[PDB]
Design a protein around this ligand. Structure first.
Ligand SMILES: Nc1cc(-n2ccnc2)c2c(F)ccc(O)c2n1
Length: 124
């Protein structure tokens, strides 16, 4: 079975909106979402659908852009670093679960480089 997906809301966690968090949704995530290699990362890994029964035996902190998008829409984050940390978890999950040079890793690496370019300059 799949685990429950990561939370996209939490009433105990304080919310915030910042210029940088608004940018991470409307520019960074919105652009990455349209990349031709974005599709494996637009929702939590469905280990049942994708026939990856070992995925959550290996990956204990799952993250994906669908979850990040909902968190940004929820104002779930306190600051941009918290959101950037989720992107980095998503990329590292792929590199942990898979081997260097695998097709899915090549996809993640293309997105990671675009991600790095986009957050190189954030609004003030
Ligand atoms: N080895 C794989 C295979 C995946 N996949 C792709 C199509 N069908 C299975 C996959 C994935 F969607 C998302 C994240 C991953 O890390 C994946 N890793």
């Amino acid at each position: 079975m799949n685990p429950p997906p990561p939370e996209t809301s939490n009433p105990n966690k304080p919310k915030r909106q910042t210029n940088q968090l608004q940018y991470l949704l409307r520019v960074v995530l919105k652009t990455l979402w349209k990349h031709q290699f974005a599709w494996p990362f637009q929702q939590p890994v469905d280990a049942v659908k994708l026939n990856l029964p070992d995925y959550y035996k290996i990956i204990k902190t799952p993250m994906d852009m669908g979850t990040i998008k909902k968190r940004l829409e929820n104002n779930y984050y306190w600051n941009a670093q918290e959101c950037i940390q989720d992107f980095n978890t998503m990329f590292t999950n792929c590199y942990i679960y898979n081997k260097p040079g695998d097709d899915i890793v090549l996809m993640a690496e293309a997105l990671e480089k675009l991600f790095l370019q986009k957050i190189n300059e954030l609004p003030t």
